[PDB]
Symmetry: D2
Subunit: 247 residues, 4 copies
């Protein structure tokens, strides 16, 4: 019933307005703590070296000069009158799938909710080009999905990662419980000079359309299905522990 919202696109981004409309279908007790600005690539980082600055827009909406992870902690530990029952992060402008999950500020917001002991869901909306994001699709489908998930709980320590395909609402083919996909890791550095002549680089990622696993988040979205992947924060490769020849 007490729902806390954050995102990585910023307090003023349309995706967050969309999330709050989704949230209000589930409860009236909604709280928003979101970054001041875009947080692309910020992953699960938080702000320890500099002060956090909190800006109140109204008694339920706050912007924070910090990461999504900072936002969730601020919400849970300072802003709300008690722990939220659900944390929602998004709706991101652009999908978060496969190896994105490690780098995603939207996914990290949910993670943080989960580390704080709260049920948490990340939501991301695939689009096409500039951006025409079919927000109505997440908006039409997210409420009932979250309602069902909340009704059937899910395990402690696991968060849900939802991606909505670039389709019109009535065109989405269905929903699938997926696994995290894998794409080729295509990091690229572009070297330039700044006009006082000093070198610098831009980092970006080539995002190829290669084959992925048929049960992946990617494959689902390519098929026009909503993807729901349960994710956890234990990174141990348990199957590997036994070797250990010789410890």
């Amino acid at each position: 019933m007490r729902i806390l919202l954050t995102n990585d696109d910023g307090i003023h981004a349309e995706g967050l307005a969309v999330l709050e409309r989704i949230a209000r279908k589930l409860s009236d007790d909604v709280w928003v703590v979101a970054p001041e600005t875009d947080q692309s690539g910020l992953a699960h980082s938080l702000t320890l070296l500099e002060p956090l600055r909190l800006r109140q827009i109204d008694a339920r909406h706050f912007a924070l000069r910090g990461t999504p992870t900072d936002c969730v902690i601020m919400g849970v530990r300072h802003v709300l009158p008690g722990a939220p029952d659900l944390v929602l992060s998004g709706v991101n402008s652009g999908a978060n799938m496969a190896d994105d999950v490690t780098y995603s500020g939207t996914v990290a917001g949910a993670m943080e909710g989960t580390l704080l002991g709260v049920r948490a869901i990340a939501l991301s909306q695939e689009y096409e080009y500039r951006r025409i994001v079919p927000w109505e699709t997440a908006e039409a489908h997210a409420p009932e999905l979250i309602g069902r998930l909340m009704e059937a709980g899910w395990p402690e320590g696991v968060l849900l990662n939802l991606n909505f395909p670039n389709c019109a609402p009535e065109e989405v083919k269905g929903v699938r419980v997926t696994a995290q996909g894998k794409l080729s890791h295509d990091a690229r550095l572009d070297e330039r000079r700044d006009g006082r002549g000093f070198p610098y680089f831009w980092l970006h990622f080539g995002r190829g359309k290669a084959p992925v696993a048929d049960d992946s988040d990617i494959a689902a979205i390519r098929s026009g299905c909503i993807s729901m992947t349960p994710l956890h924060l234990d990174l141990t490769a348990h199957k590997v522990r036994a070797e250990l020849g010789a410890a």
Copy 2:
């Protein structure tokens, strides 16, 4: 044989000098690409929104105004004459165990090595700061040698923690699971020199029960801990509870 080093403590930090002495026990072909400044809590974030600035100290040592993840990408894709055979990240001033792994720049350095297709190890030294660097320094070379000698699986990185003991006092080594600690985030509220509010975020140690197979338990016992980690975050066991759809 080609070894790339990075850390989160910065190019000038003693932990990185320690790592390079360790690395030189394994090969003379060592390359260093490390942040300009000491930077906690950066996790697996990278720098997309601003330029990266690379600074050459000598032919094998480079500082980068960016994250450990940026450092590994720069090293692999731009600075080295070909892919390294091994990426080492650390030796961090402070342990990285249990829920730290999600937030650790030191660990993310290794994660990035792995995502680039390279065997990778993160190394961290528990302290009280008085950091008993000599302990990691005494024990790391042989451990890494054995690990390299035995393969380990593709997609898995190793997370090594050394206890706060004198070198001759360490009790042994254990292949461990990632522990789970209680989330212990603290916000201190203040007012700046102009009266305006701000917050400091920091973390205490939390109060969880330690599993006897965890990284934490090993370190508490005076043992070196080695946890194999992987980058598939799917909670596979949970997928089947999909009511009511496929996967």
Copy 3:
């Protein structure tokens, strides 16, 4: 007739909305390039080491992640179709008087206009606290600025000089008049407050003890304390010309 606006309070600050209303009393050809956020203390600094990021709000309003000086240069050299005839900077939330001038982003916005060859005016509005909130009587700058600027533009003033305008904290109909003032001099009371962060590491806040000491009767400060609008002509030649001849053996 072509007017460019900027400020140091940010694209979304009320003082900039105020300045645009004033500007529209003087022309319909108004352009706005302003910082994304608050710029206190940024003086005449500009951004050389990092990229500038421009954001278009509409055809005449742009936010820039940079300083008020960066804004003017962006406006003059990139955004507008030709040089503005007038650069206005403000209306700042708080006065910019005396030793402030060297540090003020608002004043710098005008300085940059002037160095770019354009008539330029900085506007600032004095306020009072209740007791933490600022109550800024924007209506005062709003009521009085249009005619003052119109008269100044009509009479013209020398090239290389910018005007620095302060409005007192009075209701519009209470302002006692306007004075051409000199820059005042306040006691310089910079203070360092030492603290420890959440992890125990030291840091400092820099702040300034303000205080009501006596100033020169022809100063900007004195005028504002009297309830008068202050107009100080400023220039960008810092040479202490009177002191050059004073010599310990060399030409010039």
Copy 4:
């Protein structure tokens, strides 16, 4: 006798090692508070919105994550055991003349010293490029600055005025002399170079050149172009006094 040094080039920059050598010709009581990194274009800005972080290198050398202005305040009010008698700011890598003075971190260091009630001098060294390596003839400032500052300190100068010193790009023994100059007026040569980042998003670099135009024969610029050291007394009253009477009206 107590001398505080700062710069805009940063605690590790050669120009600050040069300045300390110059300073030690004048006193053995020298204190250094300088920025952690390069501070081009920071003018007289200071740090109000974020914390200042101070780092001790030696008992006499400190780096501050902040502006030259912040450094001088820190040095005067906190680090030194009492006010310095002299603040020196530089030796900058590159001249600071004419309309540079308004933008210059090095000059602002000296400005702040003056506002804090201390005699202050900014020092800058003109250079040239060999391709892209700047070759800065530091030896020129080094050779000439100690005596000039000695004389200046021996003769007083007025309260509220700072001195801006520029050394020409000449070999030490080739400098033609010294001149008390006026601040020049250059052409403002700014432009904006538009690019796209790794993700396709626009950004600009702000390029500021020098003007390339004729200047007054008594300016800092004309002196330096002639191979002379330039010394310009500057003050912090920006009032255009000659214009006030005109303006009422």
